[PDB]
Design a protein around this ligand. Sequence first.
Ligand SMILES: N[C@@H]1[C@@H](O)[C@H](O)[C@@H](CO)O[C@H]1O
Length: 311
Amino acid sequence: SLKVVIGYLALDDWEFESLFPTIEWKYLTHINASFARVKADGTLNINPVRKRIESVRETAHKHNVKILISLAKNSPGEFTTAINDPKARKELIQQIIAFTKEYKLDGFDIDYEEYDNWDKNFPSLLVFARGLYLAKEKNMLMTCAVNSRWLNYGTEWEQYFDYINLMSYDRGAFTDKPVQHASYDDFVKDLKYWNEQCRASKSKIVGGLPFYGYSWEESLQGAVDDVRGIRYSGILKHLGNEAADKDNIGKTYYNGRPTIANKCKFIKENDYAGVMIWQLFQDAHNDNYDLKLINVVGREMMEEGHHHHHH
Ligand SMILES: N[C@@H]1[C@@H](O)[C@H](O)[C@@H](CO)O[C@H]1O
């Protein structure tokens, strides 16, 4: 089966202008334009993507990369409210299909993360999934960003998606207490979980990879964001190039090149669909080109090899 590399791209990222011209398209098969936000009434807040979606699509397509619009809650409870209301649900489904057609995208990605009353709300989420699947075009791609092991998705869910992107990161990282938010062991167990418990064929299961981490270091308390999150580019900037080949330095935990490489290796060695990346823009800049994580994924998943013309 064909391997994939699905990269998330935040279209309203502060570093967009500067970094967009550097996207390594040869190492990507799909990109998820980051978030048209779902509103309580089923309508979409497309402010984070409206200004660049068309331009991103033209570029992606020029490099034969598929582009999907990723959807997530506008604010807590809004995505749930939308799917729990019949008319708002039908409106939402029409908006997604319409946005996808209007901007000539290849599909859409569902990133539903309303954890309040998860089990109670799942039947309505399924009703939503079934609907989108029925309303979408046959050729339109339909993917989803999912959690593993800690939340049930049942065994029906899987069949409606071309690719299931496992968010194997942020594990136990929102308290004091430094932790590795994306360990190798958790990555492997998450993959197993979807194949053995959610009964999803390995052929559509894709392992998520983080191009960022967290730091509980006192010296970086202002460099990290809202939740102590820090980009790989930030990690190299403050911790030095030596950080590129480790998953931890002091109280800063992330995924260095060896681990990213090893996760990619596991994917290939066990015939999974491929890998996914949360935020391509978080990667190192060209000042550290050789230490870029996308190049590690590229060397593992999209290695051209030695070839010649006139075969
Ligand atoms: N014709 C091939 C190219 O397609 C390939 O990209 C290049 C890589 O070095 O080798 C050439 O022989």
